[PDB]
Amino acid sequence: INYYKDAASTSSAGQSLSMDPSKFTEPVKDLMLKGAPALN
Amino acid sequence: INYYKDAASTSSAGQSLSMDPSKFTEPVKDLMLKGAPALN
Amino acid sequence: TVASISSGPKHTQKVPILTANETGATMPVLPSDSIETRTTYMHFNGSETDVECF
Amino acid sequence: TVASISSGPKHTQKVPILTANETGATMPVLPSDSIETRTTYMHFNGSETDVECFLGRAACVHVTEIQNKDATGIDNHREAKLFNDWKINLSSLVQLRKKLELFTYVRFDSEYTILATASQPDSANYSSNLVVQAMYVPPGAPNPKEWDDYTWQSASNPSVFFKVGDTSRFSVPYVGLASAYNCFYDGYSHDDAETQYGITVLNHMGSMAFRIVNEHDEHKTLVKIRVYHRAKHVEAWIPRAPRALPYTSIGRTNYPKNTEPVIKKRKGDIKSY
Amino acid sequence: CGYSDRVQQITLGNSTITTQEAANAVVCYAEWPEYLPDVDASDVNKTSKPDTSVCRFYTLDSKTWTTGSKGWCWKLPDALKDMGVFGQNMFFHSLGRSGYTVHVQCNATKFHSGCLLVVVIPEHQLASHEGGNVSVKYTFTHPGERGIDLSSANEVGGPVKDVIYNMNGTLLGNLLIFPHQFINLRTNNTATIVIPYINSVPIDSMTRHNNVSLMVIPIAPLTVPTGATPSLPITVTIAPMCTEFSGIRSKSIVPQ
Amino acid sequence: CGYSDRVQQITLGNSTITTQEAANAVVCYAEWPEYLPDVDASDVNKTSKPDTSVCRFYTLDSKTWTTGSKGWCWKLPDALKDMGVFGQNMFFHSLGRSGYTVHVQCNATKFHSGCLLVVVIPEHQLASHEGGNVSVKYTFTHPGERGIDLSSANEVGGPVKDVIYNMNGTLLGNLLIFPHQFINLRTNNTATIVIPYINSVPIDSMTRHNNVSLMVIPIAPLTVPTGATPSLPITVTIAPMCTEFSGIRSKSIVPQ
Amino acid sequence: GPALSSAKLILAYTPPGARGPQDRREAMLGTHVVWDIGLQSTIVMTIPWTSGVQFRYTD
């Protein structure tokens, strides 16, 4: 329960469970599957 | 009612009514009944 | 959440350990790709690694 | 719950009073097995005998003394008590250490209370309105070197600000790497002929560095910070024998030479009452 | 329907022990040893199970029980780290996991008197003889099949051998809280204690960390009949069970 | 659908080998190794399976391939009887059973020329150098990881090293009947041969009896380019598989 | 290196408890991955989690 009206008072959001490390680990145009030759 | 989100804040659990002193008093392989000869 | 999957001996043409970092991609190679691993669970959520807590 | 059942004269071949302790079992022989008992009830639950209450009451577990003064010209500050640090150990006070050692493994989230009191034995017209900064130091966190070090920012190190006399109250989830604290560790941290025995990763939880952040007044205020601890979410395993000899160190069961007897000698022979 | 509770037979691998005056075997904390389930594993390498090769009764050198013997103490798996392939599986890895089925043997006639205390003390961290803040040196707490004789002289780095204080500051009368059994020469001659893996972690080192410690402490002094030899042999036999190892490694290097 | 037949990966236990110019692996007689079924067992003791501890790639000391090298010969499981816990499981029993996944390694550039003959000869009983009715002494045929260098001088009790006669009286050109593979520096640099257990019995001794023998015989002489080192390293890596042992015994006593 | 070069390397991971490998025969006993340098210029050896305790200290 909040005691104030404006959003500056609300508490933190906790944790963002929506993870997606692909944008940083595999920022490649063509799809690369584990095991298959990276270049062919 | 809790005022905090993380489990470090909750109160104690009270009492664990689930008791089982057999593991400490009778940690024997074969079952021993009161009255019957312990060894035969 | 599963941490490491069960994997036995591997004799195949698919080599997940060989890649080319010239592409700039980090293949998510797991321990089950290089050795024989057992079934294990994470038992961890990562609440303290979020940017909101860090 | 029934305490004692009704039992009259017993003339049978089943002898519940005779057994063989060579088996290692403790037969739950009741008073109704040796005498004639009446129907009685327990009227008792045992809420205060639980490990959560036996080990889960706030108590003092460490203490130190420091000062807040004009620190000019004191090259070695920390060793001069311009700020003092204590390695977290539940084995420095004996009346709680014994209760904790009664078992081999204990898992608990902790509760800490840091008690500081202002005082001036020397000439001092008043007792300042201090604001004590209490800081948690995880393994690796820069063990501060001066009262004004680059650590007190506390960006990752937990900090709690509060005035002297009043106490902080922060909870700590179980910070062990195992499923419990190794109350007894019959093992070494690694294989070396010069390593320390028992005291290992399981023992070191970090340390608590005490100070004051207010700039100095005109006199030395020798502060004694007493630390109190309550155990929360207590779980115990592998009960052990009660502590008989006292301690000399933390985490070590080592005792002194020529220790004093613990058994109360009788006055007379074995037949005296 | 006629049987006996003192006649027991334990067959593990290719070893078989027989007894006719044994006491009800003690299962420490009513928990039989079991393989580490996947829901608790933290390491990633797969475990190897030398089920039949190492899970067998290994007989340790017998001890001489005299009228002045204080007791004996053994550490596990240290007591079996020089025994065949178990020692190699223990050294060549960084960690190990296995249960133990201890079997103490002490036979005598109906004229002898005495009582031995066979107790398993998990995490038996012993006390040093110098006090203050002295440590106990790895070279002593890990003897091997030799064990620790509580009647010998103390050496620099070996813990104190005051059997009264259990070598750790606890009284002898309080060791009964641990899983134990008495070998009463009039009633019992062989004790059996099935020891599971007891530790705060799913897996831990087996060379630097000994999970349990076996102790044989004579409570009642040995009173042999008139004209008999004032000595009785005590043979300790331990059999690993549910053994596991992870991370076959360059041999673990111990001193000597 | 795009892949390659020269890029292969073999993962056994905690060891992993990678190659990009390998030839189609040879499965000796199209029979993969399999555990001894009950319908053929003659011994009564139960077998122990150190699946993960011993079934891993053990890299043997590399050899130097010169313009005058005749070849090299290795005996199994002799070649791995001093390797970690496999050697102990091999000695401390009277018999053993296990397959082998041989992997020879010899890399070079596109300018070098030469061809190695990697062949597995089951029951390679070698010939003595003295003729008549002389025997070959156990001390030589069982070198260990050392192997037999066919270019060295003969010693009393070691078989003859005439690579032409395959050390047994058979011509080199006829060894191709056995499961083999050529390491052609222009086409292949790593050979792989999965060797199953080959013997007339369900189980036999593993210390006194070597089931198979690995040979690396250079057929075409090494012709290095002008100005290059006239030597190429040959690394042999063997991985046991489907290992079994029966009758844990007092250590097998070999000479030395 | 040059594309016309050939070389075989063995990356060996030694779990805790044993000293650092001083030779190749001692290194190859533990977790190792034989790297064949060819068209694939990069090798990816995942160091497996081999520990008794659930977590190790960063320091």
Curated annotation (Swiss-Prot), chain D:
It is found in: Virion; Host cytoplasm. It comes from the Viruses. Disulfide bonds: none annotated. Transmembrane segments: none annotated. Signal peptide: none annotated. Forms an icosahedral capsid of pseudo T=3 symmetry with capsid proteins VP2 and VP3. The capsid is 300 Angstroms in diameter, composed of 60 copies of each capsid protein and enclosing the viral positive strand RNA genome. Capsid protein VP1 mainly forms the vertices of the capsid. Capsid protein VP1 interacts with host ICAM1 to provide virion attachment to target host cells. This attachment induces virion internalization. Tyrosine kinases are probably involved in the entry process. After binding to its receptor, the capsid undergoes conformational changes. Interacts with capsid protein VP0, and capsid protein VP3 to form heterotrimeric protomers. Five protomers subsequently associate to form pentamers which serve as building blocks for the capsid. Interacts with capsid protein VP2, capsid protein VP3 and capsid protein VP4 following cleavage of capsid protein VP0. Interacts with host ICAM1. This is Capsid protein VP1.
Swiss-Prot record, chains E, F:
It is found in: Virion; Host cytoplasm. The chain holds residues 76 to 331 of 2179 of the full protein. Interacts with capsid protein VP1 and capsid protein VP3 in the mature capsid. This is Capsid protein VP2. It comes from the Viruses. The lineage of its organism: Viruses, Riboviria, Orthornavirae, Pisuviricota, Pisoniviricetes. Forms an icosahedral capsid of pseudo T=3 symmetry with capsid proteins VP2 and VP3. The capsid is 300 Angstroms in diameter, composed of 60 copies of each capsid protein and enclosing the viral positive strand RNA genome.
